[PDB]
Amino acid sequence: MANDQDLSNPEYLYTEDDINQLLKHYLGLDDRISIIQHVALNESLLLKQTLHQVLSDIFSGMQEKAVIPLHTGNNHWVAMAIKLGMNDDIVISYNDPMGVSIDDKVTLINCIKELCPGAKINDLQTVQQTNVYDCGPFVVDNLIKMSQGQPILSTEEAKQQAQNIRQSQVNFLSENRMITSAAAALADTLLKNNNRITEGVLVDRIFDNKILSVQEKQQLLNNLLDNHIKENKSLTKESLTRMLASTHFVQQQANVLLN
Amino acid sequence: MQIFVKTLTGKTITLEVEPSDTIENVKAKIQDKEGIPPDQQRLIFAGKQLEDGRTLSDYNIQKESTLHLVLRLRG
């Protein structure tokens, strides 16, 4: 692991993945919220296509709202949230933790005018970030509050709470790294030498596993059956790891699974 | 660093790699993400097939370089 991966560093710089994992943790139980993972200001086509997809899902009712951590520069993310207002209009709320107006991001604005000129834009324009490394914590906190309909941290509140919101977010990131590592170790023992496995083979490998106890197999399988094992999907190391990481089983036994 | 792998179906895979990663390591990451056996993969960077025991730095692959992935038929 590289030194810039040390969560105990008060100046730890969030990655795109960190932000996504935190939004999924705090917002992802609600299936009707689109958490957008990778979108950048220097990707006009991909940005217009993602915004089109999100607005279409909100218009067509498949989603109620969306959170979009928009990457605008070196370690800089802006918070964009999209939802249905009270007057049959799309409401785009936005805050740059540096306090720069949304008008400075002309590629974003021209992309929104081109896609939805009849959308309302609430640019909250609130300075929060007081240093180069705190954009991550604030884009996360902002997106959570915006999607909850709660006011974002004011400039003064941001100064008092900057260290607290970072602390509780990195506390999750640390626990989540453990869960993902346990899930990946367990996935390895179940996948054996295979490139893919079906859910049906996954079930049989858990049955035949010689490491887990009967009670552990029973909990893991009940967890999987709750949301999976419906259509015999074929899984990769990555999608099996994600599936296992989301089980109560791995969350409750991650340390035992790694040691 | 971030690199991209183009596929024949028009999708682009994004991988997180190190210059010291072997080509085999990169094929293992593609297998982890796409379910493609490494023995079915041939990777190209800028007109050069990538040999399994070399490293990404042997080929001067850079941040945001794009590779091309071609899958074997039959085998």
Residue numbers in the entry:
A (entry chain A): 1 to 259
B (entry chain B): 1 to 75
What sentences appear in the manuscript?
Last but not least are erasers, or deubiquitin­ases (DUBs), that remove Ub from ubiquitinated proteins or trim and disassemble polyubiquitin chains, regulating the signal. Here, we explored disulfide-bridge formation as a strategy for producing a stable DUB–Ub complex amenable to crystallization. Using this approach, two disulfide-linked ubiquitin-bound complexes were crystallized, one involving the Legionella pneumophila effector SdeA DUB and the other involving the Orientia effector OtDUB.
The OtDUB construct, unlike SdeA DUB (which only contains the catalytic cysteine), contains two additional cysteines (Cys111 and Cys116) beside the catalytic cysteine (Cys135), all of which are present in the core catalytic domain of the protein. Even though the protein sample remained as a mixture of at least three different species, crystallization trials successfully produced crystals that diffracted to 1.85 Å resolution. While the terminal cysteine residue could not be placed due to missing density, the proximity and orientation of the C-terminus indicated that UbG76C could be disulfide-linked to Cys116 of the symmetry-related neighbor. In probing this further, we harvested crystals from the same batch as used for diffraction, carefully washed them and subjected them to SDS–PAGE under either reducing or nonreducing conditions. Within the complex representing the asymmetric unit, OtDUB makes only a handful of contacts with Ub, leaving most of its canonical interaction patches (the widely used Ile44 and Ile36 patches as well as the C-terminus) unsatisfied. Since we went straight from the reaction to crystallization without purification, our results may not entirely reflect the situation in solution.
